[PDB]
Paper text:
The selected 7476 scaffolds, which we refer to as 5HCS (5 helix concave scaffolds) throughout the remainder of the text, have a wide range of curvatures. Our method for computationally designing small but concave proteins to bind to convex protein target sites expands the space of the protein surfaces that can be targeted by de novo protein design.
The unbound crystal structure of 5HCS_CTLA4_2 aligns with the structure of binder in 5HCS_CTLA4_1 bound structure well with a rmsd. of 0.416 Å.
Numbering used by the authors: 1 to 103
């Protein structure tokens, strides 16, 4: 399945950036993930958006990319709205935990 495979690759890329403190790789990877998150939200792929935004938050905080942090605040706003409208209690708590880690 092309979408799951690609999300899994994006998660791996960001995970390796986080473990290696790879500041050089991070800016390109974070901008890409920001665009993927917006698509995922548009197509109501909320499970995958939650797993990707969590590792995106970890990386953005670790490398202190203040622009991406600001963008992630907005995407978290939208994601929380969308998980609440779909009444998904497990996703709600996951998004809250990410919000608490970004803050």
């Amino acid at each position: 399945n092309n979408l799951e495979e690609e999300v899994q690759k994006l998660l791996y890329e960001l995970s390796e950036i986080w473990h290696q403190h790879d500041h050089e790789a991070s800016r390109e990877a974070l901008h890409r993930v920001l665009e993927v998150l917006k698509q995922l939200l548009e197509h109501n792929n909320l499970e995958q958006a939650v797993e990707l935004i969590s590792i995106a938050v970890h990386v953005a905080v670790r490398v202190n990319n203040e622009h991406v942090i600001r963008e992630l605040h907005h995407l978290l706003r939208r994601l929380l709205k969308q998980v609440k409208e779909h009444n998904n209690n497990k996703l709600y708590i996951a998004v809250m935990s990410v919000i608490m880690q970004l803050e």
